[model samples]
Target chain A: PTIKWRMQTYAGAALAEHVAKPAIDLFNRIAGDRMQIELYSADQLVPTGELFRAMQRGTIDAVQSDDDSMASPTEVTVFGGYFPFGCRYSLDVPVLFNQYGLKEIWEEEYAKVGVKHVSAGAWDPCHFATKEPIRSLKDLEGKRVFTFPTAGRFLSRFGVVPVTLPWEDIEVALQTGELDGIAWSGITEDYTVGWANVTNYFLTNNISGAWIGHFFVNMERWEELPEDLRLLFEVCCEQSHYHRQYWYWGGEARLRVHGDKLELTSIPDAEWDQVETAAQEFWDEIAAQSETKAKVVEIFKQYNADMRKAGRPYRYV
Target chain B: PTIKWRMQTYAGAALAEHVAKPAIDLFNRIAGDRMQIELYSADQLVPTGELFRAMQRGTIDAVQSDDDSMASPTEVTVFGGYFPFGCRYSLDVPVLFNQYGLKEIWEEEYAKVGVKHVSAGAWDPCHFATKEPIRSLKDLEGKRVFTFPTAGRFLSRFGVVPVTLPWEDIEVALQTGELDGIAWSGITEDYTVGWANVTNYFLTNNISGAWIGHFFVNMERWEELPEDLRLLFEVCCEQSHYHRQYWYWGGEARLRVHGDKLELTSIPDAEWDQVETAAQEFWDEIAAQSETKAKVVEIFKQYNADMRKAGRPYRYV
Candidate 1:
């Protein structure tokens, strides 16, 4: 009899097609006759906001979650997701979090919330896709933008109107002129959501290392797995992380091909600096919530330093 | 009897003391009684410009050469040093070259000149330090900027008067108002050379991932080393590459201490794009020099893609 595990991903079908399913298939292939994994794309088994409760209630054995939904459970966990202008970039996320022990810290922290942290998977940078061209920082003023609440706060400070709308509603809103832009996930995911059809410009400032997804297992279920089986699941999660990044990066060229349809712009250096300053301040305010949050933020800052010292080229630092 | 090799570094005493010597110590510790290294700081045995010839003629068994000196030997080999806007940053150089195979390609190319490529080591970014406040791109106009010929070409396109003055003359030049700015090595090295005292603004545009140093051995001597000893030296070179970066990154905090003395500024994004345009054009022109150069450039481009795909955040790509 094959030992099987059911895993639910926070990302919708399009993301699962590229970033999640490939890793699942690889895991299944590697497990061979001994174990199998059943992957439920976003909302397949449970809603995105309900993943934590689903795992806790044993309705699902595991979840490949975006930290955003679960961030409030233990506020410091927001560090696990993309902090606006938080991480250096994409590779820096894994290099710092995985290679430099952020993942281990994350695991230890998640254990406090009753989740067995498997690993971080499928991280990407978040950027804005606008209906109108963003020629200068002034262009953002008074525009109706949609994004996460934390990032929305930073956006509001820039004189833009920030709103939170369902992902499914974004395309229609952008088309109908209710939303002028979005501080959504990467170009690949934005494209996947059909934002390319409605938005004419894709700005690549990478405001935050967005949607840094992770794998989590129910603590009780994880404890029940045999040691060898647990090791196999861990290997699968690692593979998943690698596979997702590969797809995200690979899609870059494809996105560039749409440059004719949508202009890709980098925010001006001075403006970017302004945004960073705002982000730093926002982090400080949020981190002030608790010592742990402050410590995580401090650790993230130090990790950036350590990466640079290790000779890694982190642009922000 | 210990098998020892004489190693000359392209960096002067200050850099050698930090980046080069620590690696040598680490190598010595690990090699134990089997092998040893005798290190020579810049110009101790021969001038920096003569390292390639010195290694070729067997006057020196090995030299840690900065791509700066060997840049002109094969015209476009300047890409080996730093193209204005070329490499992602410091650590990206080795991670791309070594792991992505540029180092091996470099070895193959240098072998034609009678030097056996040992490894690439000690990398850092190059930026400008200005006497006056650099508030915008306009500030660089008409400035007498000191930098490499290749980088000078890119700087000249932006209305700056690029000069290749001797390092010894830089202090006096800046003091007497002979020079307006310098596009030198990393901020740490610039501070070591005492630019902070003369220049009040440290521009952090990172014109290029400059000063990517490499290790080379006399082909004849390299061929004669016993296999076990050769492996030991290889290990040492790898460790040296890592250690040099650690110190380079470690200097970040030290550089910050001088923040009050010098105002750090980032170039406006629009202006940075202009510099990148100049770099890309310059690279295209140089790459047309030879198929080898074009091939190297192509490899570099693909490596950027790979890095991005691997979820590394590199700005230029």
Candidate 2:
């Protein structure tokens, strides 16, 4: 019997279409006709960040997406998504995945709410796209910078004023000149959203890059599948990783090809160092800030150490 | 030789702490002189939501935490942490942990950044601890609801204004009447924070009950451990589910223990349904509104089908 399901995502279909779609295609091709997967973009059914909640309640069967946006609900533990700066990079996703076993944790955690999670492919890193020359923190002083939550700490260090708003709103704000600078996930999705159109400059610091775009199923729905079909489906996902990983890599290539047209600023080493140091401080500050964060810190510490021992780079080049 | 590590958490050391601390203790105990873990409760250094940044850059090796606070940085993915309307019960910790395989993913992910993840046990689920009664979605209209990121969307249907604040300042806001309703995480945490002292009514519902806490470590520090000790440390985490699971089941017991001290308010099934309906619309809106969301949705659908065949339950509960 073919199973029907609904999925959710916030940004562009880059991950879904370029990465996960191909993965699902492989799953369907290998699973025979018993499994039919239907895809829905974020607005097709729910708002960004609400997918996990909807899945938990069974409004939707499963989602191949994120819970990063959940940080807006409470400022305590949410910084794990992207903290103190723009976006994360490929190198970052693997590190986070291994450290906390975030994917597995999400799977089990989602299962509690009757949702099941599968593999999460890595997304591109985040970079700062600015309208003005932002060579250092001093250049950011009194700037009405549009950013996500972690911006407060990083921008504050530069004496720049940070404005927190919804991700979608960033484009509008930038278009209206309400924001001097903005950051998006990576070159592909960044260009996908036409962020390049709104800002003139792109800075590559890879603020938050360890983004994991998940593929989840409704736990109940998953159980109804025939054993053989399930095995085939799992195998498909396993094989699909290559496709998704390649798409992420390809997206960056596309951006590099097109991004050359945009005004770019290379963050000075001193400034970059400052930002990284601030990021570390930001992470510590967050853990210290809330009970929720302390747990995130603990997870990362062990994972990072182990990866090093294994000689596996947690981050993507 | 044992590697010494110090960390911080938001919970008061005297009361029940988050899962990270306990997990570390278990690791240290099992590692046998190969590793050491120490924890500091909230206010020890930074406030909530700031810890992840610190941990990522090797600020402090570990911390007790929940990922819900990451909402501020990445809104798209943070929803999983908050659940539906806030307050995922403690049992959800294991369920989610098992479903997501977070420990594995996190270990790998954090290792890149020099961190580790540890599961101590589950904490209590969060719930609406408000100053007044919540009879219908209308009653929530215009109410200043204090909640984390993922849960905020549900409030939109009722027209209740939702504002997210850092946990550190929650008491002051609630006591000063800055917020009308506070989505206190669990029976124990609420009681410890004395949420009832400021507000007496608690809304009970299975919004989402998948909350897990973890301990993180710095990767470099993790490398200092013996191979057997590392394996033992992991074994400790896997076993942590046994003790932490109690935190979930104990919520009701604590609620009963404090019966009459705090009012248990139940929203009508109709109201609950309405909330769900509203949530669905929001989820759809997000997908449609952003290209980023649409792509993520595609993967969600595929995964949902896979997991559904795996005998996982979906929302009716």
Candidate 3:
């Protein structure tokens, strides 16, 4: 006889394929005899972002996704997804999380809300897929871009209006010429989702840090595991961190193979400077959201300083 | 009774402080009862590059330093250091080493020489610290720069002469106008070794991928460890991978804080394109050095393609 567990992933088919499936396979193979685990891709059980609440209510055992799903009551919690211009690549923020106590901070914060923060997995930067070329700062003005709320605020500084639409609606909007571009996940995801059919250009400036996905088990479910079983889970989740890097590698490799379909473009260094300036200005506003956020923002300053000292300075600097 | 082990580092006090010491502390704190490890900074136990042979002879139990000291019999071994224009930051190459099986490859290759590749700890990008500002292609022409052998070959295409001088003589050489600039570890090291006192400018375009450091144990010594102790060592080494990102972070921060001392500059897009072109042409020659080198070169092409697909395109691309 074995202990059985159920887990839910973050989103649609792509995340299931690239992010969750690999970790699940690893956990099952290593712990299958003692603990049988089952997985559900997005929307099979609770809707997106509802896994946190569902787990809290004991309807689900675990959730594997970006921490943003359990949105903090304060707007500052949004930083958990991907801070604009915060980290440039996978190594950036994850290092802070693993080495600089960001994970501990996150675990502490999330525990108060009722889930046990298990671990983090794969990560990727965010980018923009556009209909028209944006080589200069001036081209961004008056453009309508599809983006999330915090990033939307950052875009507004460049005179670009931000529009939020259902993920399904983006292609139609691009096809109808209603949207100039969509600031989205790294090129591979956008292309896999077939954004290349509607857009010809891909902006190569990584707009934010690597978008990290986290794993959380319901507190009650977590407490039920025996010590050795718990240790196995912890070790497997840790190894998944390396495994997830490969998934990102696969996505990036796919993007490169299909690069011919979408012309890759970069902003001039001068224009990038302005974008960096705008990101900082926008970050200030977000940091002022609450005492907790302001504290996190201060922590970020020291984190950034540490990153710079390590030779991975933010590009804008 | 503790199993006392002696390990040697590849750099001076600064790197020992920021990189090697941290890993040692983690290992000691976690494995103190089973293993009492002693450390000797560069030149303390054996001259730089002698640790590999010393460990093989049983004079030293382990070596915690860059892989360059082992001197791979094939030219491909040079890839163990930073690959020119390969990875832009610290996380880039380590991801390849861990996810792409380069670590396995290295262990398999090094095992023939009687050493076991125990771990990789940290990484940093290489940059130019110059006496004169390098803002344009013209300024790079005819400049005498201090750089490693492979990178020196790459720099020669720009009409610059590459010079490698003893580290002890660099300051005197720079002060006496014997050198124009030194292509070296990023900001923190330059400032630490007092390069800023002689050079007033720092170039931000990273010359190569993140330079990686490794830890190796004598094959006989490694085999003697108990399975659980080995597991603990493996876990701590894995943690060191993340710990190294801070070394990169710290370098970037020093560049910012010492902004007034050495002005940091980024090359213009048009000129940066030329550097990118030069890097590719140079890479072709290095890859042709041997069959193994050619194989690794092919691996890098796919790696670059993957990185680009992830939206972290090589800057010049």
* Highest DockQ against the true fold, candidate: 3
Query: What would the per-residue lDDT of candidate 3 be over residues B22-109, giving only the tens digit for each residue?
Result: 6567567645576867877766787755667898877998887665544534344577565677776565555667666677778877
User: Could you estimate the TM-score for every candidate?
Assistant: 0.54, 0.43, 0.66
Task: List residue ranges in candidate 3 displaced over 4 A.
Answer: A1-65, A72-75, A82-88, A92-122, A126-209, A213-250, A256-317, B1-3, B98-101, B119-122, B130-149, B152-182, B192-199, B265-282, B301-317
Clashes of 3: 19
State residue A142's C-alpha deviation in candidate 2, in Å: 4.9
Local distance difference test, each candidate:
0.68, 0.55, 0.69
lDDT of 1 by residue, B198-274 (tens): 88887767777646667778899888877645655665565466444544554543465434667777777776787
Q: Model 2, range B127-164, lDDT digits (tens) per residue?
A: 67778887666667788867655566665656767777
lDDT string for model 2 (A186-261, tens) is 5666677667788787665556654545566767778876664554454445434433343454345435544554
Compare candidates 2 and 3 on lDDT and give the better one. Answer: 3
The alpha-carbon deviation from the true structure for residue A256 of candidate 1, after best TM-score superposition, in angstroms, is: 4.8
| CA RMSD of each candidate after superposition | 10.9, 24.3, 7.4
Specify the CAPRI tier of model 1: incorrect
Worst window of 10 by summed lDDT in candidate 1 chain A: A308-317
Off by over 4 Å in 2: A13-16, A29-32, A71-80, A83-92, A95-104, A142-173, A229-241, A250-254, A289-292, A302-317, B1-317
Q: Runs in model 1 with CA error above 4 Å?
A: A98-101, A159-169, A209-211, A246-258, A265-267, A304-312, A315-317, B1-317
Assess the local accuracy of residue A30 in candidate 2 as a C-alpha lDDT between 0 and 100. 38
